[PDB]
Amino acid sequence: GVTTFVALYDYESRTETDLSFKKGERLQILNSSEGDWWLAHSLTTGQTGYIPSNYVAPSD
């Protein structure tokens, strides 16, 4: 199923595989919410990559 989140803070990409996002973006994960880093897709930007769980909160 869909598992969505909204970003609470801006995050700047620092690796080859993470995802930059801004506060307020809607983000979905492409596996489960286990662990601290999730492969995600931004509904806002269309970009993808790993995001840190502690920058986002659940969004229905």
Side-chain angles (χ1 to χ4, degrees), residues 1-30 32-60:
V2 168
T3 309
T4 39
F5 302 88
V6 58
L8 306 178
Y9 320 120
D10 296 353
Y11 175 78
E12 181 199 10
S13 165
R14 295 306 182 80
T15 75
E16 302 294 337
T17 53
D18 62 354
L19 170 62
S20 295
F21 54 86
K22 305 287 192 188
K23 181 169 173 179
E25 285 187 29
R26 296 244 306 148
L27 306 158
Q28 75 184 314
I29 60 184
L30 301 182
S32 98
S33 76
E34 170 183 295
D36 301 313
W37 282 90
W38 304 327
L39 184 72
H41 161 254
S42 175
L43 286 70
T44 308
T45 72
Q47 293 297 290
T48 71
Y50 292 105
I51 65 176
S53 61
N54 58 8
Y55 276 56
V56 310
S59 172
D60 289 338

